[PDB]
A paper describes a structure:
PmoD/AmoD represent a family of copper-binding proteins specific to MOB and AOB, the key players in global carbon and nitrogen cycling. Sequence analysis indicates that PmoD/AmoD comprises an N-terminal signal peptide followed by a periplasmic domain containing two strictly conserved cysteine residues and a C-terminal transmembrane helix within the inner membrane. Here we show that PmoD forms a copper center exhibiting the features of a CuA site using a previously unobserved ligand set at the interface of a PmoD homodimer. We further show that PmoD is critical for the copper-dependent growth of Methylosinus trichosporium OB3b on methane.
We heterologously expressed and purified the periplasmic domain of PmoD encoded by the Methylocystis species (sp.) strain Rockwell extended pmo operon (PmoDMet49242_1452; there are 10 other pmoD genes in the genome of this species). The copper ion is coordinated in tetrahedral geometry by Met42 and Met44 from each monomer, and the two invariant cysteine residues, Cys41 and Cys65, form an intramolecular disulfide bond. Given that the crystals were obtained from the monomeric PmoDMet49242_1452 species, it is likely that the observed copper-binding site is a crystallization artifact. The PmoDMet49242_1452 structure differs from these canonical CuA domain structures in three distinct regions. First, the N-terminal histidine ligand in the Hx34Cx3Cx3Hx2M CuA motif typically derives from the loop between β3 and β4, but PmoDMet49242_1452 contains a small helix in place of this loop and lacks a histidine in the equivalent position. Second, the loop between β7 and β8 provides the other four CuA ligands, but PmoDMet49242_1452 lacks not only this sequence motif, but also any histidine, cysteine, or methionine residues in this area. Finally, the N-terminal region of PmoDMet49242_1452 diverges in the orientation of β1 and β2, as well as the presence of an additional β strand prior to β1. Instead of the canonical CuA ligands, PmoDMet49242_1452 contains a cluster of surface-exposed cysteine, methionine, and histidine residues near its N terminus, including the universally conserved cysteine residues Cys41 and Cys65. Thus, despite the overall similarity in fold to other CuA domains, the PmoD CuA site is formed by two protein molecules and a completely different part of the protein structure in contrast to all previously characterized CuA centers which are housed within a single cupredoxin domain.
Residue numbers in the entry:
A (entry chain B): 37 to 163
B (entry chain A): 38 to 163
Amino acid sequence: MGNMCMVMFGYDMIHITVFQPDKSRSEYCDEIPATGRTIMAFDIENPAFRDLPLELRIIRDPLTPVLPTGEKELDALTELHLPAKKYSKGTFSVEHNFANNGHYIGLVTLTRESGQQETAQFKFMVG
Amino acid sequence: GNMCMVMFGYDMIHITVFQPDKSRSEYCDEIPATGRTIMAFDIENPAFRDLPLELRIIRDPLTPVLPTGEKELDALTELHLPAKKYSKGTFSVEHNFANNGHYIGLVTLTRESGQQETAQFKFMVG
Ligand SMILES: [Cu+]
């Protein structure tokens, strides 16, 4: 559908759609108006990424210049965590009840099969 | 915002969409209803502020090759802003989308090499 809402790896993008079925039939991007049941759908644009491990961690935004990299520190901030896996169909959804308004960051980590890791951030807010 | 944008290579123009008569929410490439809509543009790269920028929003013909002929683009056109420099880096346009359907925003930048680059943002109404 749309091509505007995204997280980026260079030229390769992952399109994101957000909806909140308990509140509305509308679709959102980085300004999510309500607390509650939230579904985030990911559509990987580059077919080659379907064979690449992809991890998602959504954290409360600590508003620090540098994001924590330690797993214990990241865990303290974590709203939701999906371990790395290959998405062969190129698409997936996550559902979460956001009980609290605030700023959040979705951290998408790709593992190149050079074994190198790249992380991209999509920043959004709830409420 | 940080997620909603049209791309020129690695460069971005961030886009926010509102419908003030309907809701206090902000949208991106899915506009929920027909009617009064405001699209706000924020040009991230300072060098792009000195570049002529043209905007044409068309109904999406859903074909692999987009018409380039002026009559054909005009037949599909919802709104057209002639090329202009946005020195402040931001601007908004207001339009009443009367019809549900798929749309394409054609953004044309004129490099100071004088060559033109177009990017497309795709969205839908309803
Ligand atoms: Cu982008």
